[PDB]
Design a protein around this ligand. Structure first.
Ligand SMILES: O=c1cc(-c2ccc(O)c(O)c2)oc2c([C@@H]3O[C@H](CO)[C@@H](O)[C@H](O)[C@H]3O)c(O)cc(O)c12
Ligand SMILES: [Mn+2]
Ligand SMILES: [Mn+2]
Length: 180
């Protein structure tokens, strides 16, 4: 789906597109062939960055996007300084205000299905899950949404805009049905 490749390179900042290309090739996947997955990885990374800008200065440490050594440097450091237990898998963010790791989900499916999958693969009581969709729906652990409605609205409106531009290019149907 090379027209989706064109969309991704036009839609996302070059720093995001470059990181997503690297991430896919690390798993032997070709961004030029799995173009729907490339778009999905760019979207999740953009959401993670928008979320980290969503509250007070330095509220959040970003873990997603970092090379593995630096990501685990951030996590092991945080788990020595704040004493919070050590996750088995790298989470997306750490929230200094609530003293918890956050896992961010972005889904073309239903939020409840994706929430349960994240909860099950995580198996760690401490990690806060926040799920976004392209349709305006969000859902978070204990209905605790972490950010104010205005910052969440920026994220939800950004995902809608992406869905709308995909739809105008007849890319949305394939993209929505690509997720597994
Ligand atoms: O770097 C990666 C990061 C993640 C990823 C996904 C969700 C998160 O919440 C998350 O923190 C990280 O997913 C990747 C996937 C797949 O990306 C699909 C769409 O994001 C997912 O639906 C699939 O399950 C994934 O395997 C690849 O194929 C390749 C990759 O390099 C990556
Ligand atoms: Mn992640
Ligand atoms: Mn995530």
């Amino acid at each position: 789906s090379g027209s989706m490749e064109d969309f991704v390179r036009q839609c996302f900042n070059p720093m995001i597109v470059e990181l997503a290309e690297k991430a896919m090739k690390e798993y032997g996947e070709d961004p030029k062939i799995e173009t729907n997955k490339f778009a999905a990885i760019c979207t999740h990374l953009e959401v993670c960055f928008m979320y980290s800008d969503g509250g007070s200065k330095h509220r959040f440490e970003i873990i997603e996007g970092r090379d593995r050594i630096m990501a685990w440097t951030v996590v092991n450091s945080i788990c020595n300084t704040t004493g919070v237990e050590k996750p088995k898998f790298l989470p997306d963010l750490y929230d200094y205000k609530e003293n918890r790791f956050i896992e961010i989900g972005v889904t073309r499916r239903e939020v409840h299905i994706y929430y349960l999958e994240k909860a099950n693969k995580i198996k760690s009581e401490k990690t806060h899950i926040h799920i976004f969709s392209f349709t305006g729906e969000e859902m978070a652990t204990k209905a605790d949404y972490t950010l104010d409605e205005e910052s969440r609205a920026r994220i939800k409106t950004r995902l809608f805009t992406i869905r709308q531009e995909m739809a105008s290019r007849s890319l949305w149907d394939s993209f929505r049905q690509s997720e597994r």
